[PDB]
């Protein structure tokens, strides 16, 4: 936002937002998978208790 001018920084900002959102979607997916695993382990632990 300081080297490049408003409308040529946009495709750059668009690509940066896409890259930073694709890196967060997979993180949320892995977090959901690990949370499901932890939930299954906790259900097993509660049954054993």
């Amino acid at each position: 936002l300081s080297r490049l001018d408003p409308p040529e920084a946009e495709v750059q900002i668009d690509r940066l937002i896409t890259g930073r959102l694709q890196s967060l979607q997979t993180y949320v997916t892995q977090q959901l998978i690990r949370a499901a695993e932890i939930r299954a382990s906790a259900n097993l632990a509660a049954t054993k208790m």
Binding site: S2, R3, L4, D5, E8
Partner: protein
């Protein structure tokens, strides 16, 4: 004096304040095309060479 496109002249510019307005304000031009930087922002920047 301007050299040929081979054996092209090269000048290293350092320890100075760069008022780029003195350049693009000049009437004879066909191109101030700028890759990786924009004409308007040159006066806000600092360059390591």
């Amino acid at each position: 004096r301007f050299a040929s496109v081979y054996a092209w002249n090269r000048k290293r510019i350092s320890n100075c304040v760069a008022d780029y307005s003195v350049l693009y304000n000049f009437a004879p031009f066909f191109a101030f095309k700028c890759y990786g930087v924009s004409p308007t922002k040159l006066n806000d920047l600092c360059f390591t060479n």
